[PDB]
Amino acid sequence: SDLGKKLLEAARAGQDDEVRILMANGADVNATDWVGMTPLHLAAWKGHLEIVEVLLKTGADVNAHDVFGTTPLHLAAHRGHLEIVEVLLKAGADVNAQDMVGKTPLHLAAYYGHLEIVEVLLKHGADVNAQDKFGKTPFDLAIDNGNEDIAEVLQKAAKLNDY
């Protein structure tokens, strides 16, 4: 319990050596903080690639959901961490996971303007027609935020899917 708390703190802070020390001493790799986030959540969100990699290699739950229903892939998509998105997907991240209001990682990547992540997600089977609880698709969010390059890529994928 104490090691897990320290592991969470180390993962958030990007302290690679502390993370490994704690893991080598039995720290629960899937420990959760007060909002249900795991070391993998925090390292993925903050862009700490090496910590993500060691966590995944050692068996961390790639699709753990926090209290908001967001997964590590959601979080990497939010902050635009492309290489982390790729390793998460290779480790089995659910490309179409939905948080508590129905948002998928594609929603987040489209809204927050991360074009490359959008393309990678689509390539891994992201649902271009996914609607959140308010009926918004990723395309709607790109349009709402004036992310026109992303909107075009999403339109292309939808036109392919519609054939």
Numbering used by the authors: 14 to 176
Published text:
Here, we report the selection of designed ankyrin repeat proteins (DARPins) recognizing mTFP1 (monomeric teal fluorescent protein 1). Here, we report the selection of DARPins recognizing mTFP1, one of the brightest and most photostable FPs in the blue-green spectrum. We characterized these binders both biochemically and biophysically and determined the three-dimensional structure of one DARPin-mTFP1 complex. The two DARPins we report here bind specifically and with high affinity to mTFP1.
The complex with DARPin 1238_G01 did not crystallize, but the structure of both isolated DARPins was determined as well (1238_G01, 1.6 Å resolution, R/Rfree of 16/18) and (1238_E11, 2.1 Å resolution, R/Rfree of 17/21). For DARPins 1238_E11, a high affinity with an equilibrium dissociation constant (KD) value of 3 nM was determined, while the affinity of 1238_G01 was found to be lower with a value of ∼88 nM. Similarly, upon mTFP1 binding, DARPin 1238_E11 remains structurally unchanged and exhibits only minor differences in the N-Cap region (Cα r.m.s.d. of 0.45 Å). Comparison to the crystal structures of the individual proteins showed no significant structural changes for both proteins upon complex formation. Anti-mTFP1 DARPin 1238_E11 and DARPin 1238_G01 differ in 13 out of 21 selected library residues, suggesting alternative binding epitopes, in line with the ELISA experiments.
